């Protein structure tokens, strides 16, 4: 279908022209290879007497034939004081271009040799130097990036600090317990969820077997996530259309504490609200994000509808309890605002979606694999797609601020 | 720049050009 490909490119051209109206910040960067994963690291540095701050991303590569890498990248973001750079006028477009219109703001800092594509990479909250990765093989890997060179050996020899065993297939779900240092959950296409405790690894060993294996799902487990306050609770979602809440203290690992028929299709992602301890979201192939209360899982609270294809990722804002975002197979990324649920709309606005749909990011031209909210700069998002594009963006203030 | 109605409208209509 060459016509749809032509339409997408023409629609991108319209979105690009519009950016100064809708964004305070928009950067588009072409990675050497596409990344399946994206997570902002928590640290930020503010060098002396300069107009920018430096933030960092955990990324990966997706090469079919070539050497893949675990990647750490730096991103410069402008301070509120900063001056406009007017040295890049363009007579064709009739514009100066904003912050990061040209190369200079994004850089690859570290590349660590990694066997196969990086399906997902997530840092350990208690020690951001530690990064777990999901590979196309069964072995979940842990890297302490300070124990590695910044520039890799060209042999491409993958030498992880730990190799975590338990699974029979690859997966995507990866979640560190923010209250129990070293406790990692993993989901897989083998229908299981594994749990490792790496806080007390003997003698500087290199392999670790799974402490527990949860076997409740009857299909591919797509995502897993710890509760953010309760160290024994965690959720999982799967192609069996189910949301499961698990208790690690329970003696039966084949049955969850609770099971819910959450969707009319595969459930691909979940995320706990970081402010409200009972709220969580799930995304699905039925094109909806569902909202849940842990204290009554029989009743779905709400359904966010508008997405034009399957949803694979969902994340809450780290700064605003009412704000979340979702992405998937369609090129658009949606930002929702639950406070605006039920607000009456004119028919003209209702054509574009329900009132709780705050923003549609149209900067990508291919399936979005992952995105991450910047924990230190409110409203900044990093999103990555299958065509190599990485965008760091921020919608215009007046969209969310009246 | 634009009214609340128009800025919201542009926020949910990514692929339609913005005019004044
Ligand atoms: Ca609150």
Residue numbers in the entry:
A (entry chain A): 10 to 411
B (entry chain C): 671 to 690
Direct quotes from the study:
RbAp46 and RbAp48 (RBBP7/RBBP4) are ∼50-kDa WD-repeat proteins that were first recognized for their ability to bind the tumor suppressor Rb.
We extended the C terminus of each MTA peptide (either to residue 695 or 711) to explore the extent of the structured segment and collected diffraction data to 2.15 Å and 2.50 Å resolution, respectively. Two molecules of RbAp48 and two molecules of MTA1 were found in the asymmetric unit of crystals formed from the complexes of RbAp48 and MTA1-(656–686 and 670–711), whereas one molecule of each polypeptide was observed in the asymmetric unit of RbAp48-MTA1-(670–695). Rcryst and Rfree for each of the final refined models were, respectively, 18.2% and 22.5% for RbAp48-MTA1-(656–686), 18.9% and 23.1% for RbAp48-MTA1-(670–695), and 20.6% and 25.9% for RbAp48-MTA1-(670–711). Our data show that the extreme C terminus of the protein (Leu-696–Asp-715) is not required for the interaction. The structures provide a rationale for the higher affinity observed for the MTA1-(670–695) and MTA1-(670–711) peptides as compared with MTA1-(656–686). This cluster, which cannot form in the MTA1-(656–686) peptide, interacts with the aromatic side chain of Phe-30 in RbAp48.
